[PDB]
Amino acid sequence: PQITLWQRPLVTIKIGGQLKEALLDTGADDTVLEEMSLPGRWKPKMIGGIGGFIKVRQYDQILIEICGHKAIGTVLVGPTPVNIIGRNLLTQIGCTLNF
């Protein structure tokens, strides 16, 4: 599909059998979701945004469906303001910017 940017590019994602809303963010290097429970062990990571840094939990090889497209990659979990789908997963679904 083709998504315009007059409004936030929010889409529905499926993870852990649950539906959630997330933002397609080309400005994010990684994918970060709001506090939730995921399987396996996690590794520590610090990510810096416009207002500073925050600590997040890194989970690898996580299955996530974005607009029907299945992806399997790294997902970070932490005190993010909104769910963010970053470049690591946008590339998996073949997302590009056009103009």
Residue 5 neighbours by CB under 8 Å, 6+ apart: none
Query: For residue 10, what are its two tokens?
Result: 């929010």
Question: What are the structure tokens assigned to 83, written together?
Answer: 């769910």
- Tokens 């997330």 correspond to 22
Binding mask 48-77 for its own copies (x = CB under 8 A): xxxxxxx------------x-x--------
CA 71-29-33 angle, 5° bins: 60
**Among this protein's residues, is 25 annotated catalytic?**
yes
3 touches its own copies (CB under 8 A): yes
HSE (side-chain half, CA atoms, 13 Å) at 85: 30
Q: Is residue 30 at the binding interface for its own copies, with CB under 8 A as the rule?
A: no
Residue numbers at the binding site for ligand 568 (CB under 6 A): 23, 25, 27-30, 32, 47-50, 81-82, 84, 86
Can you give the binding site for its own copies, defined by CB under 8 A?
A: 1-6, 8-9, 23-29, 32, 47-54, 67, 69, 80-81, 84, 87, 90-91, 93-99
Catalytic site positions: 25
